[PDB]
Scaffold this active site. Structure first.
Site, short mmCIF file in Angstrom:
data_model
loop_
_atom_site.label_atom_id
_atom_site.label_comp_id
_atom_site.label_asym_id
_atom_site.label_seq_id
_atom_site.Cartn_x
_atom_site.Cartn_y
_atom_site.Cartn_z
N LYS A 85 0.83 -1.19 0.00
CA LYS A 85 0.00 0.00 0.00
C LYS A 85 0.87 1.25 0.00
CE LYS A 85 -3.38 2.94 0.88
NZ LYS A 85 -4.42 3.28 -0.12
N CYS A 140 -1.99 10.45 -5.90
CA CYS A 140 -3.10 10.19 -5.00
C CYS A 140 -4.14 11.31 -5.12
CB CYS A 140 -2.66 10.10 -3.55
SG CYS A 140 -4.10 9.96 -2.45
C1 LIG Z 1 -9.43 0.54 -2.92
C2 LIG Z 1 -8.37 1.20 -3.77
C3 LIG Z 1 -7.26 1.77 -3.17
C4 LIG Z 1 -6.21 2.31 -3.92
N1 LIG Z 1 -5.07 2.73 -3.26
C5 LIG Z 1 -4.05 3.09 -4.01
C6 LIG Z 1 -2.80 3.45 -3.40
O1 LIG Z 1 -2.59 3.34 -2.19
N2 LIG Z 1 -1.78 3.87 -4.22
C7 LIG Z 1 -1.93 3.94 -5.56
O2 LIG Z 1 -0.94 4.31 -6.23
N3 LIG Z 1 -3.11 3.64 -6.18
C8 LIG Z 1 -4.11 3.23 -5.44
N4 LIG Z 1 -5.32 2.94 -6.05
C9 LIG Z 1 -5.40 3.01 -7.52
C10 LIG Z 1 -5.08 1.69 -8.20
O3 LIG Z 1 -3.75 1.30 -7.91
C11 LIG Z 1 -5.22 1.81 -9.71
O4 LIG Z 1 -4.27 2.76 -10.19
C12 LIG Z 1 -6.61 2.21 -10.19
O5 LIG Z 1 -7.59 1.66 -9.29
C13 LIG Z 1 -6.85 1.76 -11.61
O6 LIG Z 1 -6.76 0.29 -11.69
P1 LIG Z 1 -8.10 -0.62 -11.90
O7 LIG Z 1 -8.84 -0.07 -13.07
O8 LIG Z 1 -7.57 -2.04 -12.07
O9 LIG Z 1 -8.91 -0.41 -10.62
C14 LIG Z 1 -6.36 2.40 -5.31
C15 LIG Z 1 -7.56 1.97 -5.90
C16 LIG Z 1 -8.53 1.31 -5.18
C17 LIG Z 1 -9.76 0.78 -5.89
O1 LIG Z 2 -5.61 5.79 -0.58
C1 LIG Z 2 -6.27 6.27 -1.47
O2 LIG Z 2 -7.20 7.03 -1.33
C2 LIG Z 2 -5.76 6.16 -2.88
C3 LIG Z 2 -4.49 6.50 -3.25
C4 LIG Z 2 -4.12 6.50 -4.64
O3 LIG Z 2 -2.97 6.69 -5.06
N1 LIG Z 2 -5.15 6.23 -5.51
C5 LIG Z 2 -6.46 5.97 -5.18
O4 LIG Z 2 -7.33 5.72 -6.02
N2 LIG Z 2 -6.72 5.99 -3.83
#
Ligand SMILES: Cc1cc2nc3c(=O)[nH]c(=O)nc-3n(C[C@H](O)[C@H](O)[C@H](O)COP(=O)(O)O)c2cc1C
Ligand SMILES: O=C(O)c1cc(=O)[nH]c(=O)[nH]1
Ligand SMILES: Cc1cc2nc3c(=O)[nH]c(=O)nc-3n(C[C@H](O)[C@H](O)[C@H](O)COP(=O)(O)O)c2cc1C
Ligand SMILES: O=C(O)c1cc(=O)[nH]c(=O)[nH]1
Lengths: 312, 312
Positions: free
Chosen positions: B44, B131
């Site tokens: 994370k 973020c």
């Molecule tokens: C529950 C959740 C938490 C996420 N937390 C992070 C995070 O801590 N850091 C990050 O770089 N992206 C975070 N993201 C973004 C995902 O890494 C990703 O870039 C984005 O959801 C697109 O991918 P997907 O279409 O497969 O969901 C998060 C997304 C979700 C759904």
């Molecule tokens: O922790 C989150 O809110 C989070 C971080 C991030 O980089 N991307 C995202 O969709 N959520």
């Protein structure tokens, strides 16, 4: 029950209209929109001289919406002005014209020409600051200094209330900066949110090839892809620019999506991809579905729920 | 038939890993990712001190994907360093750590701590510049001067190869300007495209209320919403950043979507929304489906088609 909207010094029979660029390039297109049950119509984003646009294929319908790189095909400002001055039937509904000069100098010359027609006929301007599909022409709305210039020069040359078509923003700082620019221009009376999500890429897995020809397959996304982004932008500007109207554009296929847009703050609701798919009969269906929803909620007018989205 | 990926000094059994933020906040989560058939995993996005994140509800699964405003809930950098130094089984697969300091100074302190552990264990850094969910903290990747300062200071402080998790861009000039910044930093060996589409808004028509509590309902979009944007960003940086790797993230629900990312230029393929929906068993399915596509097309390795999407 009433779907009427009173804005901009007109009564609109209902909130619905075409999105710029869809069913609005030719006189035939404009006729079909006029004879539609839509509350309004807007002409294709036009330029000073005519354009034929990009090579084919430049549009591709998708399960979740559309990708396009049309390239601003248009009959030239003189066509749209003549339409507005001579052809359009204003007893049917008000007319918007979209203008998308590729430089501030071009826009100035175009809006200057509209002035007498707006004064005579009541034709409304939407300035397009968000075309993502002309190569080497970045989206003006993503540059706040450039955007300020266009608004300054157009406010000076046109000198009458007008509206702006905005690109989607994705950052709170951008909402803040965009609104700070827009709030400096009292003539900017409405904000259309949003134009397509720029420079997406669609690839066909069978043949390993992009689906549109221009810009190496890169084009703007319409349809279901855009609805949450559209709702956000609408609501963000609704809150930040209280002295202006917001129009909703993006993801509308049904009365339900129209209801969401209005709840977020939309005065008018524009329909692009869905209209391209279904034809102008959609306006009749959207009026019925929106009335159905309101009937179910016991609402009699749009004003009962416009901008009343609830937060937690 | 081989899904192997050889990059950054490591052998990876397949191109799949979790997207940062999904199944990776706790030791249990990381265990489950390690035991999965994934080629790798990422922790994370962490901060110097622990965070509990935004209030609830802050996640909502949608028919077309997800909206989240998690707000960087994490156990603090010492937790993740400790996992990387003492707990993770590197014989199973390589580990990445995502770091999202909310200032450049915070980011510096955090990466300095990672140096000895990278040297000893091979732990790879992904710097989060995207973020969209921490209030008052605009996405760094949308300010190219700020981005330059972070990469400068992290490059000096960490002094080893690292990656960056970028926000999605929607304008060609932004692709050019982002690439121009990234290309000034030889220690940036990979680029992850993309983070969620920032600051969307979902509204429930039944209760006329937003579905997430923080920021008046505004949250990052994932899933099917983001596939064309993801593919575009991957391809755009693949072409502009030949000295670097691109990792693809967004819209991956199947082998076919994985294939498209790879064809667009991806070295690794991250899975967010779909992993949150299905759990880590998905990685077994993605490997099978990608293998099947490669088999049908006669590809023996990923290197045969990586970045070989065809234009017209
Ligand atoms: C529950 C959740 C938490 C996420 N937390 C992070 C995070 O801590 N850091 C990050 O770089 N992206 C975070 N993201 C973004 C995902 O890494 C990703 O870039 C984005 O959801 C697109 O991918 P997907 O279409 O497969 O969901 C998060 C997304 C979700 C759904
Ligand atoms: O922790 C989150 O809110 C989070 C971080 C991030 O980089 N991307 C995202 O969709 N959520
Ligand atoms: C074929 C096509 C052409 C378009 N041309 C224009 C245009 O000329 N001017 C403009 O402001 N927007 C133009 N757009 C964007 C739409 O007006 C609209 O903002 C976008 O498609 C999102 O709405 P939708 O989800 O209902 O399609 C065009 C879109 C499509 C699909
Ligand atoms: O003509 C087009 O290319 C066009 C213009 C515009 O503003 N938006 C869009 O999606 N396409």
């Amino acid at each position: 029950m009433s779907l009427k909207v009173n804005i901009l010094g007109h009564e609109f029979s209902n909130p619905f209209m075409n999105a710029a660029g869809v069913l609005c390039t030719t006189e035939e297109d404009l006729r079909r929109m006029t004879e539609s049950e839509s509350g309004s119509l807007i002409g294709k984003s036009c330029t000073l001289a005519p354009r034929t646009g990009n090579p084919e294929p430049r549009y591709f319908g998708l399960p979740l919406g559309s990708i396009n790189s049309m390239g601003l095909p248009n009959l030239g400002v003189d066509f749209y002005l003549s339409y507005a001055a001579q052809t359009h039937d204003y007893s049917r509904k008000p007319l918007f014209l979209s203008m998308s000069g590729l430089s501030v100098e071009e826009s100035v010359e175009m809006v200057k020409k509209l002035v007498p027609i707006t004064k005579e006929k009541g034709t409304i301007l939407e300035l397009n600051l968000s075309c993502p599909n002309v190569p080497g022409k970045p989206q003006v709305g993503y540059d706040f200094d450039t955007t300020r210039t266009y608004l300054q020069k157009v406010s000076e040359a046109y000198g009458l209330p007008f509206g702006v078509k905005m690109p989607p923003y994705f950052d709170i700082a951008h909402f803040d900066m965009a609104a700070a620019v827009l709030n400096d221009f009292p003539l900017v009376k409405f904000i259309t949110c949003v134009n397509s999500i720029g420079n997406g890429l669609v690839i066909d897995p069978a043949n390993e090839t992009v689906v549109i020809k221009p810009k190496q397959g890169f084009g703007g996304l319409g349809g279901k892809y855009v609805l949450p982004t559209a709702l956000a932008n609408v609501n963000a500007f609704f809150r930040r620019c209280p002295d202006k109207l917001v129009f909703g554009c993006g993801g509308v296929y049904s009365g339900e999506e129209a209801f969401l847009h209005i709840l977020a703050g939309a005065s008018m609701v524009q329909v692009g991809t869905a209209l391209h798919d279904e034809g102008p009969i959609i306006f009749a269906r959207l009026n019925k579905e929106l009335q159905e929803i309101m009937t179910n909620k016991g609402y009699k007018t749009l004003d009962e729920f416009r901008g009343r989205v609830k937060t937690m």
